[PDB]
Each structure stands twice: as C-alpha cells, then as structure tokens.
C-alpha cells in the first residue's frame, strides 16, 4: 500500500491539456462519492459538487477564467465546488445540520447552538463577517477537493484544481443559468478531470521537506 500511495502522490500533477478520452461513469461516481463522504466542520455539509457538462456555460465562463482555459476546452469532466453563504450559528443551515444528525429538543439542540455561537463569535472570530463565514464553508470544500484528486490519482485519472477565475463574474453567469442561487451560495473552486494529453514539461517542485514538516518533541 505504501508504494501504491507513493505512486499516486507522484502521479498527481496539475494538467491543463487533456485527451479526448472520457472518464467512465463508474470512475466519475467514485470520485464524487469521495467528495460527498468527506468530513465537513460540524457536519454542516454546506457544499455542492456540480458536474458541468453544458458546453455553452463553459464557453461563457472561459473569458473570465485565466487559470482554466485549456481545461475547460479539453477536460473529460469539469466539476464546480460550491459553498454555502451566511452559514451563521443562528441560520437554518446550521439548524438543519443538527436535526439531520438526530439532535432535537432545544436543550440538546439549543445547547449545541450555544456552543456554535461561541465557536463563530470567539473561537474563529467570524460570526459577524459574511466573507469569513463564506471563506469557512469554502475551506471545507478543499477537503473534498483533496479527496477527489487522490481518488482520481489512485484510478490513474488526471486532475487540476482551479482558483484562477473572476469569482463575481463566474458567480453571476452561474446564477443566471440557475446553476446556483447567489443569495444562498457561491463558487469556491473548480476541478478538471481527464487523461493528460502528454507528460508534464517540468518535474514536480516543492520546498525542501524540512521547511514544511517538523516535529515538536
């Protein structure tokens, strides 16, 4: 399993140009299962993963997506990662995550809601800052993003994680096609999936591992 994992870690690279060859529906389903089963802080699951097969919408997004030109053009599949806005402790979203989990009264539910108020007001210092609340739900999607990429790599499928686009212009294109509801949510990132047209030009580059990892004994 070590050699296999290590092989997947070195196989995953950010590829921009893909083969025409399409990912099977079974491989695609596995990848999305990895997203769906990902853990999210407080089990909120304030996120959605959208397979964008619609070619006109891709064409509309393209001029606003500097980091995604070739991927939007060539990728087998293109996934949008959406995060919930305004997921404040006193929101229905949060209210609904407790019920889902089998929490009820308002003395087991209003109790944990007391903790979530403390968590957002004090612990993470974000309750009264909508951008920070959005950035918090958006962070959970990066967990699913890593899970999808690792699953992909273990299947020999290439990916590219993408932030290189104008967020507000992409959000409005998505809202106008009713792909998202801009009141409730906004895009966090994009992920392309496919088979690389060719081997990467330059080798994998990272900081020396000592500048990144360490032990405090």
Ligand X SMILES: Cc1cc2nc3c(=O)[nH]c(=O)nc-3n(C[C@H](O)[C@H](O)[C@H](O)COP(=O)(O)O)c2cc1C
Closest CA to 47 of 180, 177, 165, 178: 180
> Least distance in Å: CB of 27 to ligand X?
20
Residues tagged in the binding site annotation: 12-14, 16, 67, 71, 163-164, 206
Does 105 sit near its own copies (CB under 8 A)? no
Does 143 sit near ligand X (CB under 6 A)? yes
Tell me whether strands 77-84 and 158-162 are parallel, antiparallel or unpaired.
Answer: unpaired
Among residues 19, 27, 36, 41, which is the contact residue for ligand X, using CB under 6 A? Answer: 41
Site mask for its own copies (CB under 8 A), range 159-198, x = bound? --x-xxxxxx--------x-x-------------------
What residue has token string 């294109």? 173
Spatial neighbors of 80 by CB under 8 A, at least 6 apart, are: 49, 50, 52, 174, 179, 187, 190
> Of 68-76, 84-92, 120-128, 192-200, which part binds its own copies (CB under 8 A)?
120-128
Are the C-beta atoms of 151 and 30 separated by less than 8 Å?
Answer: yes
> Of 42-50, 68-76, 84-92, 193-201, which part binds its own copies (CB under 8 A)?
42-50
Does 140 sit near its own copies (CB under 8 A)? yes
Q: How far apart are CA 14 and CA 150, in angstroms?
A: 12
Does 138 sit near ligand X (CB under 6 A)? no
Site mask for ligand X (CB under 6 A), range 56-95, x = bound? -----------xx---------------------------
User: The tokens of 156 are what?
Assistant: 């020999």
Does 204 sit near ligand X (CB under 6 A)? yes
Beta-bridge partners for 192 = 78, 160
Smaller CB separation from ligand X, 14 or 197: 14
Binding-site size, ligand X (CB under 6 A): 19
Q: Cα–Cα distances in Å, from 143 out to 79, 140, 183? A: 15, 5, 24
Q: How far apart are CA 174 and CA 192, in angstroms?
A: 17
Q: How far apart are CA 84 and CA 190, in angstroms?
A: 15
Does 201 sit near its own copies (CB under 8 A)? no
Half-sphere exposure of 175 (CA within 13 A, CB side): 13
Among residues 123, 130, 181, 200, which is the contact residue for its own copies, using CB under 8 A? Answer: 123
- List interacting residues with ligand X (CB under 6 A): 13-14, 16, 39-43, 67-68, 140, 143, 160-164, 189, 204
């Amino acid at each position: 399993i070590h050699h296999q994992i290590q092989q997947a870690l070195h196989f995953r690279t950010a590829v921009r140009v893909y083969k025409e060859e399409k990912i099977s529906d079974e491989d695609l389903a596995l990848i999305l299962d990895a997203a769906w089963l990902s853990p999210s802080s407080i089990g909120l699951e304030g996120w959605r993963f959208v397979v964008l097969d619609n070619k006109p919408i891709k064409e509309e997004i393209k001029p606003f997506a500097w980091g995604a030109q070739y991927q939007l053009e060539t990728a087998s599949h293109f996934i949008l990662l959406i995060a919930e806005k305004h997921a404040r402790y006193d929101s229905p979203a949060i209210k609904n995550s407790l019920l889902r989990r089998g929490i009820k009264e308002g003395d087991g539910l209003n109790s944990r809601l007391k903790l979530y108020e403390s968590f957002q007001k004090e612990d993470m210092d974000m309750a009264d800052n909508p951008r920070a609340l959005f950035d918090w739900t958006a962070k959970q999607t990066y967990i699913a993003l890593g899970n999808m990429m690792m699953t992909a790599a273990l299947l020999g499928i290439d990916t590219c994680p993408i932030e290189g686009f104008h967020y507000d212009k992409v959000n409005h294109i998505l809202a106008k096609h009713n792909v998202i509801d801009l009141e409730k949510e906004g895009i966090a990132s994009m992920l392309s999936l496919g088979y690389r047209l060719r081997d990467p030009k330059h080798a994998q580059v990272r900081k020396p591992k000592e500048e990144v990892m360490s032990v405090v004994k």
